[PDB]
Structures are given as structure tokens and as C-alpha cells.
Write an enzyme that holds these catalytic residues in place. Structure first.
Site, short mmCIF file in Angstrom:
data_model
loop_
_atom_site.label_atom_id
_atom_site.label_comp_id
_atom_site.label_asym_id
_atom_site.label_seq_id
_atom_site.Cartn_x
_atom_site.Cartn_y
_atom_site.Cartn_z
N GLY A 1 39.22 -13.50 -17.56
CA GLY A 1 39.18 -14.66 -18.43
C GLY A 1 40.44 -15.48 -18.30
N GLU B 1 40.00 -11.71 -27.15
CA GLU B 1 39.01 -10.62 -27.11
C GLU B 1 39.56 -9.27 -26.66
OE1 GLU B 1 38.12 -13.50 -25.00
OE2 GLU B 1 37.20 -14.53 -26.74
N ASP C 1 46.87 -22.52 -18.44
CA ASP C 1 47.71 -23.36 -19.27
C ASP C 1 48.89 -22.54 -19.77
OD1 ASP C 1 45.67 -25.78 -19.75
OD2 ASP C 1 44.60 -23.88 -20.07
#
Lengths: 233, 233, 233, 233, 233, 233
Positions: free
Chosen positions: E89, E181, E204
Site C-alpha cells: 500500500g 491498516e 508523499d
């Protein structure tokens, strides 16, 4: 002057007896003080100034629960310059070390309130009385022949507790009785640099279930009143 | 006998002086006691039994922090039948009411530890000493001409605090100094129905940054040792 | 030059083995190091510098409990420039996945302490070792033929636990054993950007109640000592 | 009957108005009710039964703070069979959406108390009123031409707040005012399957420091009394 | 067979890649797998089974936040017999130790969620991955010439944080990035005795404000996908 | 224009229906709206704008759990100027006051999340809907002949709960059902000064295990959809 006390500045003596029930405060003024003047009565919460054996003494009711007690104690100290605050009242005993007619001196006051976490950095504040006052109570009780029981009390936000299963553990940790204001009185007096102490009369035992008779309750209350008035003389 | 003490049952007198530093415990045994015998040395944590002015006294180290103190105090009470535990140690002052070399009697021990919440229903346990011991300390200090400072201490899990911005608030609530074991001693003695008290000597001021020199630390701590041994006589 | 260590700057090597018991530290120095020098001994908490296979290694005791361990680890990193810290110790096994003589590598250290909530915004800090050190330990244990068990440990403030009923739940969540310092070592090393790892020897099983004999403990300890020294080589 | 109410069973109508101040309760009985009878006076906490436009209504004081309010509400529901409880009182506004003399209906009561965490699994209990009562208040206000302000209130354990820097955050989350009992009334009514609602009159603005004069306090409170008595018709 | 997955038992391989975005999951199936079959689509949350270099691999979306991730992971383990769960992710970097395009391996997942306190005795659960998966990731990244950054992540309940002022403190404690998560994946895998690991790509930097162009984001994520698929080969 | 919504500024009407399941959102657009346009589909989380009885209405999916719901509600309010948010969903009933096919209006949302403690000073935020919207639902329900059940819901971070033993306590405190997002919707709308309300249809009973057939599921859902669309007309 304040939202909760309508006494004039200077109406309070520097030594004040406190009790949750304003009718018991009125009883003390009528039975034990001379020339007792009713100096405040906002919300029917009575306070008095009078004389005991020629010495000035004030009395003030503070209602039930830490939040109520805190309001009155804060105003007594910050506005009326009360220096010594001696709470007397009843309690529910939970320890086998005390029984009916015993008078407890609370050298600490544990609590299920969040008030002291809010005051004290979210840590554990050990709410304690002024030691000099506790020494004076011990010495006066001895002079009067009173067998003072000394230990912690547990100050609860609940009269109708949801945690009665825990009373045995409380007693194991030297909590002699449950009441509802001592932790607030102690933390407020610590906050504002005043001298405070709590004495509790055992009228009822929450474990073994014995209760005092209406006669006996007046007897044991008077015994605590005299102790309190004698240590403020 | 226990995992942390290798004395025989009966090697301890029922009154025990406690300090975090076992080398300071050994110093007390050799300078102030007669007929001192080393009775335990597991983990280099020394304990002794000897006599002071003809009366048997035991001494025991307990390491640093609430967790270490709780281990030793638990074993002393449950296995070695110790009844009265008097802790003496150093502390860092946070109140303007105390200065270097002052001796503090801790009538309450607040804490940032979670141990008492784990012990006590996730509520606030007011960790306090035994009143008879506190009376004995006050009286002995008076007899010895010691100006004993009486208030709360804050028992921290942190020697190197992350909350120095909070010291002024702690002092406002009558916390005279910070140390790291008193709340653990008091809670354990409460759990196990024993009598405990903590005295601390101000070796450093955390606010004014004053510190004692090596020579002054020895002389100030000797004064506290004498107070403790005279209380136990 | 720190309140808890009296070594000179430069007396410690940048790689340091740690254990709570200073007598076990002294045992390692005597049996496994060459030309071992005692470099600190405040509070009888011993540390050493010596050589293993021509390579400099230091050892340091840190006492019992997160608060004690934090004190020594903080000073080692900040004052004595220690860069790699390898804790070896005993633990009480709580999981069926490990048995006596197993060596556990703690890739996480859960805790009942409040210290990490105080450090870390009142949130949940996942206290973890340095990964490169854990890799080095796995690779060395393989080279030595050691069947390293890998999982979480639970670092408790309590040796005498009040939550023994909770051990099965800990084991369910991959906690293999209980000890009392790992979470503080890990959190302090994260705070100060140092490399830390905890290895534990299963000397006793808190569930099956099995226990090693005195000579099996010394043999099992030696296995972990050789593993530790070999990964610092 | 109960330790805090000395009325006979049956003395209370099933609808009861509540206020913290027993002297304001007496004032309501004498100015707005016909044939009002004092039915309880323990601790000077007065309660009355009477008629308003031919309909029976009771009034009861409940003192200050959640712990006090909880005692009286519990006994009213469990012993005296009160089914609908409508609290009216003063509050300190904290939102720019409300000014002096405004009447607030509390559709939720946030709190800094620990009482609801103790009641409710240490989770977050959303303390709310009965919807039918809130509908009745909204409709009656419309009928009477009242500009009823609707939102949350914040029920504090503190009249003298230590968190005044947080009032703007509270107002951001749609807390219109601070008082001290609503969260306790709501949680107790939820516990015991009874219908409760809190209406508050703004007598002081905690942000702008505006305060009503004692005269206009009476006039402003009369409007809320009439709203309450009308919705109980 | 479960309320959130409508695959048949046996449709999942025992190794599963996880991502919050089911559209990125579909992208992986179509670009990197051969013979991919869509096997679940409840709530538009897609999952696939296909082959990578001849070896069976499953893919599954898990939505955003700990509560969503926990639901899917729980069902994958308890119903579909998934044994190894590898989450990939994006994340928001908060540490100077990492920069854009870096791939982070999370050896711990701190959190501001209460889920692990509810799961774990209200203590601190150190949520950690499976060590063998961590080793495999490190080794595969070395093989592929990837400079894997290893440390903690902070799994937040907040994408729009209210505590941005604390990012520097989180970075100090070796949290390289924030996501939402990992702490839930890790705790669920610990609960149910499964092997889990989280890798995160830096798209980012929340501190430095550097950001990847739309084209560099796709390239960077493909880099992490290949690492993940190679690890499961 | 935001990371989770790819609609244009102005694509959303100011009134928006919400549901966790984007396929239910798509069902609503297909069956009840005219000229429905899919305006966003990031992560397969669909949103629509269309007309119901000639009035513009938007629909948006928000995924499962407070963290996911909070992301979408924040973006709808701050970026897309949504002013009224009506969530409709299923729930697991836990109270004897409701049965299958009942529609619940949540006038409060309790929670086991830490999110509101993080938002709200570590105190208790009473998460509540906008009262005007609750009034509109109640009146619209009455017009349509729907027997709206009104009370609290409990918003859990857990679908697979570890606290099923507490469901009876929740029902005692007027919690009619459990779902997973209402507390987050309500707190975000309070934060951002928007109007929100949650309606829940009882499809399953977590206590008595009664469940609706597939055909009764769609029938019950349709009744709630019509209620919601009619409220927004």
C-alpha cells in the site's frame, strides 16, 4: 458574593466544619454553638458562624458528591479565606477492621472519579489530608478516649454502586469505608494550599449489614461533633 | 528461599530499613550497626541484620523503580514475616517549600505508573503510609530537632522525565519532590496489610538546579539514617 | 559521570551485552571475556569491558523492571556512546510453542506499563527491536545450530502477577514468555536512535510448571551467551 | 422510604420537573402551582406535588453535579414510580450561536466524568434524552413563540474549570453550553428505562463574560418554567 | 460463504496479497498475473486468483481503516484458509530517513485505535509481523537491488489527522510513515495464528512535502508489486 | 479533487444519502432515481447524482468502519459542499424493543472507538444527529405509516466482536442495534457544522438469531430507501 454562598466577606472564621447535609449543619449550630448566626443559605445549603468554648468556629454544608463538595470548598478557600476545613459525616463501612460507632480518620481518599486525572496530568494523584490536622485529630481523640480508626476511604461517584463486587478488594487495600466527597475535599485543599481532614462515623456496615438505631446515630454523631469542635479549639 | 532473596526464614528482624542502593545499605550496616551480618546477596542486592542501641534492625536493598521495589517488599512481607518497612532514599525537589538537605516524610505517593490502576479496578488508589509510622517519624524528628517537611511525593517511572513542564503543577498540589519507589512500597504494604513509610532527603533541586556535592550527600544522608534508626529503637 | 554509572567516557565499547542480574554479568566477564575490566559499579550494578575473539565487547547490568532498565540504557546511549545493545535474560514461558532450553528472540515487547503511553501521545507504541540486529541473531543462531524461537514477549511491571488468568490470551497473540524489561529497552532505543534486541532463555514454564536444574540453567545460559557474543563478533 | 427522600409512596405524580436548587423548586411551587404540597425535605432538598391548569405535576430538587443528580433520579424512578423527568436549569454558554436568556434543549450530554465509562464497559456512552420528550419540547416552544436552541451540552464535574482553553473546541462540536448534571440524568434514565429531557437557560456566557443581572435571571428563568409546565400539560 | 466475501471455499490460494484499493487489486491481476479469475466482489471489494511465474497467488482488497481490514483478514483466515498475508500500500512519510519511492517494511505498527486495547486486556499490544515473512522480504529486496527501509509505521484511525504536531515525535520513535491498516492486519494475524507482513511505498512525504508525479506513482507501485510477487514465488 | 473522490466541484447535490456498500448505492440509483450519473468511483466506492420526484439528490458509498466513513464524510462536506447527510444501512439488533424489518433512527451513537476521545480532549463526546433532520424523518415516517423505532445504536470497530457478553448491557442502556459507522458520521458532522442522521433497518438479530429471507431483505431495504428519499424532497 459567589453563585453558591451569599455570606459577606469576613463572615467565615478561618476554621470550618463541613458536612454534606445542611440539616446536620443546622443541628450542630443549634445544639453545640453559642450565638450561631446563619451566614449563607443559597440553594438551602446552610452555613453558620458561632462560638465554641469562647472560640470562633464556622460550619458549612457542601452537598453530595465530589463535584458539589469541590464547588463549596473552592469558594470557602479562595473567597472566604478559610484556612482549616474539617469534614465530618457518615460512611458505609467495608472493612472488618471497623464496626458500628467507630470514627474513621481518612489519611487517604481513593476514588472512581476522573476529577483528579483531569487536575493532575492524567496521572494518579494520591489525595491526602494535611498531616498537622491529622495529628491534632489523633491527639484530641486520645484525650477524649475515642479509639480512632485510621486508614483510607474510597470516595465514589456512586451511591448506588455498580461495583459492589469490588468492596472486598477495596478493604484488602486498607479502605475502611466508602463515602462520596473526601477525594474532592482533599484535592481541592491541595490545589489551593489549605489544610483539610475527613473524619467518618460508621453508622452502617455495607458487608456485615448491621445498622445503628436512630438513637445510636445521634449518640455517635454527637461524639464525632465534640471531637471535631475540640480539635478546632 | 525466594527467587530474589537467599536469606533463611528468621534471618530478618520484623522491622526493616529499605534503600534502593545496596552499597548504601552495606554502608549503614558497617557504620551504624553492631554485629551486622550479611543475610542476602542475590543479584548483588545486599541485606543485613544487626543491632542499633541494643535493638535488632534489618536493612535491605530494593533497586530502582516501582517494579523492583514491589518484588523485594512482597518477598519480605510474605516469606520473611517483616511487619514494618521504613524506606529512606534521595529525591529531587520540585517545590519551593524544600531545599537541599531537607528530609521529607511522604504522606502520599502519587505516580505516573499504571501498577496501581492494575491493582485497583482501573480507579485511583491513594497510596499512603501507615499512620503509626508517620506519627513515630514526626515525633522522632521533633525530638532530634529535625525540621521534617511533610507532603506528597511523586513516584515516577522516569528518572529522565519527559514531563518537566509539569513540575510546577505537581508542586502546586503539595508534591515536594520526585522519587521512583514510594508508590510501589505503599501499594504493596496496603495489599499485604503491612506498615510502611518513606522518608527522602533532598539531594538535588530539579527547579533551581542546585545539587549537593559528594561530601554533602554523605553528611545529609547520615542525618536521615540516624532519624530512621532512632524511629526503629 | 552519570548518577548511575561511574565509568569514564570511552570505557564502554559501542557494542554492549545487557542483563538484569549484575552477578550474571560478572559471570560472563569471568568465563567468556579476555582481560575483562570492571568499569562501573554504582549501586553494585556492575559493567565490564573486555575482548572476545580479539574484539572489544562491553557488558552492563540494568536491574529489574522497565524503569530500572530505562535508566541504564539511557545513560549508556547518551553519555557512553553505546550504539548496539543486546539484552540476554531469562523469562517465564507462557506458550506451548516453546519449552525448556529454548532461546526466544523478541520481535515485539508488549507491556502493562504506562511508560510508552507517557512517551507516545497516550497512543499504542509497538515496541520493537532493530531489524538488522534481529537478522544478525537469526543468522548467527543458524550458524551455531540453535533453533531460535521468534515472537513477542510481554514485559510486565509485576513479577507477582495479578492477571495470571490472562496468560493464555497472551499466548494466543504470539507472546511466548513474560519478562520485565524488553519494552523499556526497545522504547528507549527507539527514542534515542540506537540498535537494540532482546533474547530470552526459557528456564521455567509458567503453564506446564517445568523447570531446569541448576546445571541445565548454566548450560542453557552459556548457549545464549555464546550466541550473543558471536553476533557481536 | 429512601435515604434521600422522605415522601410516601404515591406522593409523586408520574411526571416530575427537576432543578438543582431546592429554593427555586419551592419558588415554582408557590408561584405556578395550585394546592402545592411539600412532600420531601431530606437534606433540605425539597420536593412538591401540585397542579398546573388542573393537571398534577411534581417538582424535585436534585443538587449539583452528576453524582448528586444520579442519587435523586434513581430513587424517583425506582421507588416513587416517576416515568417522565424534565430537568430545567441554568447553564454557561460557550457557543456564539447562543446568547443570554436563550433556552437550550440538550439532545446530547457530553462529559468529563468517569461515571458513564464505569457504567458502560469503559467505552463511550452517548448520553441522550427521550425522543418523544424532545419532540414535545420542540413543539411546545414553537407554540409559545420560543426560539429554542438545540444541540449538545457538556456536563462537567467542574464549575471552576481547569480546561477553559477547550471551550472553543467544545463549541466547535456543537456544545452550546456547560452545566453539571445532564449526562447523569440521561444515563440514569437510560439505565432504568425512563424518559428524561434537559432544558437549560443561559444566564452567563463563559466566552463573552456577559452575565444577567439577578433581576433578569428571575424573568428569564420564568420563561423556561412556563415552557416546562406547558409541555407537561 | 461469509458476509463480505462470496468466493467458494478453495478459491483462495494460501498466499494472498492485500491492498486497500480493489481497483489496484484488479490492476495487479490484469497486468501481472496469468489466468486471473475474479473470485469475490461483495460490496465491490474485488479478489482474484491467478498465477505468477507458474505459481498460484491470490489478491484481495480490504478497504480503508483498521475495522475494514480486520473484517476481510478475519474471513480470509478463518473461512478461506489463507496462511500468508502480504499487504502492500501507500503511506505518508514522516521521517527524514525515508524519501519518495522508498519501500518501507513495517516491523511494528503503532496505533491511535482502541482495537488492540479491547483485544488485549487494556494493555499495550506490540502489533508485529511474522518474522519469516520479514526475512523473506528483506532477502528478496536485496536480490532485486531494492533498498528496503525498515522500521515502524503508525496506523491511524484518521486520514485527516488532528495531531499533525506529533509527527516529529512519531518519527523520533522510528515511525517512518503513517497509514491506516497495518496494526489491524498484524493484530488479526496474531489473534488467529497466521503470517502477515506490511510493505508501504512512499508516494508523499507529509513533512518534506515532496510528491510523486502521477507517472512516478504508477512506476513506484509496480516496483512494490514485483517485490511482493517475487516474495511469494 | 480529493484523494478518495474523483467528482468535479459541483457534481454533488447538497443533500446526500450514504451507505457503506457501493453496490447498494448503485442499486438505489438504478431503481429509484431518474437520470442518475455516476460522479465518483475512486477505489470502486461509487457515488451518484440524480433526481427523485424532480428534486436533485446525491448518493455516496462510505465503506465499513468509522475511519472509512470519516474520510468520505469529511471530503463530502469540506470539498463538495454537502450540507445534509442521511446514512441508511443495516444493523444487528440487540434489544427486545426491535425485531426484523424494523427501521431504527439513531438519536445517539455510542462507540468502542478511540476516535472521539482523540477529537474531544479525552472526554466523552455524546455523538448525536442533527435534531431538525431527526424531526423530518419522524414526520416523514409517520406520513408513510412506518413505525420508526428511536434510540441509541452502538458503533463498533468490530464486526467479529470480542464482547458479545456485553450486548445485554448495551440493550439495557437503550442501544437497539450495533453497526459500525454512525458514531463517526455524527462526530464528523459535528466537527464540520453539517446536518447528519442515521437510519438502520433490522435485518438480523444478534441475540435471538432471527434473520430475513433474501426477498424480505430487499423489501425491508426498499422501505427505508423510500423513507430517506421522501425526507429529502
Amino acid at each position: 458574593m459567589t453563585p453558591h454562598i451569599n455570606a459577606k466577606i469576613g463572615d467565615f472564621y478561618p476554621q470550618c466544619l463541613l458536612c454534606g447535609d445542611p440539616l446536620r449543619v443546622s443541628y450542630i449550630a443549634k445544639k453545640f454553638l453559642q450565638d450561631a448566626k446563619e451566614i449563607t443559605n443559597v440553594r438551602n445549603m446552610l452555613g453558620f458562624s458561632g462560638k465554641y468554648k469562647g472560640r470562633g468556629i464556622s460550619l458549612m454544608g457542601h452537598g453530595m458528591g465530589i463535584a458539589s463538595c469541590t464547588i463549596y470548598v473552592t469558594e470557602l478557600i479562595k473567597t472566604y479565606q478559610v484556612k482549616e476545613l474539617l469534614r465530618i459525616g457518615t460512611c458505609g463501612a467495608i472493612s472488618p477492621k471497623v464496626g458500628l460507632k467507630d470514627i474513621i480518620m481518612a489519611t487517604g481518599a481513593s476514588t472512581d472519579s476522573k476529577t483528579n486525572r483531569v487536575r493532575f496530568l492524567n496521572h494518579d494523584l494520591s489525595a491526602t489530608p494535611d498531616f498537622e490536622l491529622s495529628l491534632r485529630a489523633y491527639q484530641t481523640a486520645k484525650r477524649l478516649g475515642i479509639d480512632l480508626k485510621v486508614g483510607n476511604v474510597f470516595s465514589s461517584d456512586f451511591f448506588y454502586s455498580f461495583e459492589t463486587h469490588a468492596f472486598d478488594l477495596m478493604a484488602k487495600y486498607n479502605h475502611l469505608a466508602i463515602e462520596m466527597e473526601a477525594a474532592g475535599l482533599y484535592a481541592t485543599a491541595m490545589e489551593l494550599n489549605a489544610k483539610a481532614l475527613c473524619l467518618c462515623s460508621v453508622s452502617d456496615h455495607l458487608i456485615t449489614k448491621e445498622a445503628l438505631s436512630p438513637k445510636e446515630r445521634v449518640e455517635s454523631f454527637d461524639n464525632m461533633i465534640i471531637l471535631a469542635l475540640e480539635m478546632m479549639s
